[PDB]
């Protein structure tokens, strides 16, 4: 019986090819915390999670403390086979900090897979190796946005995630410009990230229907907590409505299902606190006839790999996984081939297929 | 026109006189972060918040980074009178971490009051200087529990918060012992810290009604997110039901009001992220005809003083403010007179009156 006898953490910063700007921040790098779990048979397993403070409230410094001083005492000396119980015991000691939980859950899955000499994708039941991602377009003036999208199409992406919600007038005018520069072979996914009110959302949808556009989803149009507005928009809309920030965990999923507040849930491991909780959401959604997609934070290729592994195992084909496009290929080329827009897992990896050698050891 | 020109912090660790055990956890100490804001006229203002990771998710290390690296750039160089906009812009950059926000909000209030040469309680509009607190009692076996309550009664406490929810069979058996040992001049408040399920909560309330006990409240019997069960319990119970972990902020308050999920809200500054958000909750609760009490984490006397100042200004008279009873008197005696069970603000203090720089070394 294998027991976890050591836990290490390491901060990893990855430079971005271009400046990444959000509603609250501008940055040139990804902040991640990595965790290493060591079994008493020598096998090591790894998980890596982002510190996206504005979204999940995680900080590198908080995650490090939580894992070292709170999770570690519960985990150390425990049997690997008891992982579900161990994780439940550990996570109940910490409210929020879902990214810290993600790191730990991933490292456990890496161990489980390595103990069976298979990939995590295989452990989770995946057979297919490949998933299509959209390309993500930051907010901007109409002109530069049209150009960004054109660059995306020229790069072979046919699904375009267009961020909205910063400037409603801009969002409205964009639709005319889209209808004029693009055909139905381009699929649009809008994410307002909470930036619209109820009336604005309805209007934006109405505006869409005035044109000829292929629009797959409207994502998180209103505040994460306004579930009534989400339900009303879902009912009103002829386009699938996606809950993202409205759903972190399984109990959030239960609420949006009960209140009929979306057609589809955007699962992100950094919100769920890893694979176990993400599986619970997918199960609830399946039973409710609610679809799931996967998404991510601006995060390391390791996080992308874990997310793709989960999605392949769960028959989730809709993915917003673009951060691979923001970093140097040699970071992920050992486990992933990105032939846009296809994210393809490499053959025969044990566990996830990445190691921390450069960061931990060299 | 005063500008904030520096922001510094210090960790505070306080030992407890006895072990604090709830359904959620057990501890012998308080970890807090203090923050100091310095105005360009040399006036300094202070806030202190607990790191209760199992409840708010805050950690000293996370709070430290958020305050110094995230909030600070927004705050530094800004005019004190711009505090509302500045806090709104800063807090938008951080999901959760409500205790970090509490520390900053309190420091701002300390400055606002000091600049007017008054106390924070005066600034907020308080008339009264005194509020009565219960004393709270750790989970434990019946005999130990009875002894702890007896200690509290001998200390002049007549309102007794009994922690439950760790062991349901123990909780049921305890009711018999309370009925045997105490009169109706002792008022009980039960707090399960989410530890019971729906069936158990109904059974406990039924059990209470088999005895002769003065029972004032049943607090957070079930999981913070099971609002349906909270509503069912609220509708079932003849005893007021208090939402604690179910309500952090104003939008949480809106939900439990809308769903009739409690009769009373337990406001804590460590959940609200400070006084500004707590004021918003009180206002919503008043409009809904819902009562409020104030509460705290097991936290430093500075947070108690801040919370008492708020309660006094808001006409909130029900309080679970006991941490003063768990720590050395000399930690608070500069700013508070605790004549048990009365928390009394001292006269003529400017701002809160914490006096933190005397005992702590602040660093940017
Ligand atoms: Mg989104």
Swiss-Prot record, chain B:
Could you mention a single GO BP entry for this protein? Answer: peptide metabolic process
* UniProt keywords, alphabetically: Isomerase, Magnesium, Metal-binding
UniProt cofactor(s): Mg(2+)
Membrane spanning segments where? none
Describe cofactor binding as the record notes it: Binds 1 Mg(2+) ion per subunit.
> SMART domains of this UniProt entry?
MR_MLE (SM00922)
Family recorded in the similarity comment = Belongs to the mandelate racemase/muconate lactonizing enzyme family.
Name the job this protein performs: Catalyzes the epimerization of dipeptides with L-Glu in the second position. Has epimerase activity with L-Ala-L-Glu, L-Pro-L-Glu, L-Val-L-Glu, L-Thr-L-Glu and L-Met-L-Glu (in vitro).
What this protein is called in its record is L-amino acid-D/L-Glu epimerase
């Amino acid at each position: 019986v294998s027991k976890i006898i050591d836990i290490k953490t390491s901060i990893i910063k990855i430079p971005l090819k271009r400046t990444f700007i959000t509603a609250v921040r501008s940055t040139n790098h990804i902040d991640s915390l990595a965790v290493e779990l060591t079994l008493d048979n020598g096998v090591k397993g790894y998980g890596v999670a982002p510190a996206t403070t504005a979204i999940t409230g995680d900080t590198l410094q908080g995650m490090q403390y939580i894992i070292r001083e709170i999770f570690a005492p519960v985990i150390l000396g425990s049997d690997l086979s008891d992982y579900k119980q161990t994780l439940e015991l550990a996570f109940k000691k910490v409210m929020f900090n879902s990214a810290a939980k993600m790191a730990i859950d991933l490292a456990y899955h890496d161990l489980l897979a390595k103990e069976q000499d298979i990939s995590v994708a295989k452990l989770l039941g995946a057979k297919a190796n490949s998933i299509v991602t959209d390309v993500s377009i930051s907010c901007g003036n109409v002109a530069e946005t049209i150009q960004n999208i054109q660059n995306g199409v020229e790069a072979n992406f046919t699904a375009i995630k267009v961020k909205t919600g910063a400037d409603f007038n801009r969002d409205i005018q964009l639709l005319k410009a889209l209808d004029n520069e693009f055909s139905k072979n381009i699929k649009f996914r809008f994410d307002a990230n909470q930036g619209w009110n109820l009336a604005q959302t309805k209007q934006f949808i109405e505006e869409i229907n005035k044109y000829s556009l292929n629009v797959e989803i409207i994502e998180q149009p209103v505040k994460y907590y306004d579930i009534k507005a989400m339900a009303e928009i879902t009912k009103f809309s002829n386009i699938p409505v996606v809950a993202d920030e409205s759903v972190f965990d399984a109990k959030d999923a239960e609420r949006v299902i009960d209140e009929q507040a979306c057609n589809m849930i955007n699962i992100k491991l950094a919100k769920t606190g890893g694979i176990l909780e993400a599986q619970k959401i997918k199960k609830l959604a399946d039973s409710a006839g609610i679809s799931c997609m996967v998404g991510c934070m601006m995060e390391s290729p390791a996080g992308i790999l874990a997310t793709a592994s989960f999605a392949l195992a769960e028959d989730i084909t809709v993915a917003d996984l673009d951060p691979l496009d923001w970093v140097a290929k040699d970071l992920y080329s050992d486990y992933i081939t990105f032939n846009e827009p296809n994210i393809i897992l490499k053959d025969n990896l044990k566990g996830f297929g990445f190691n921390l050698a450069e960061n931990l050891y060299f």
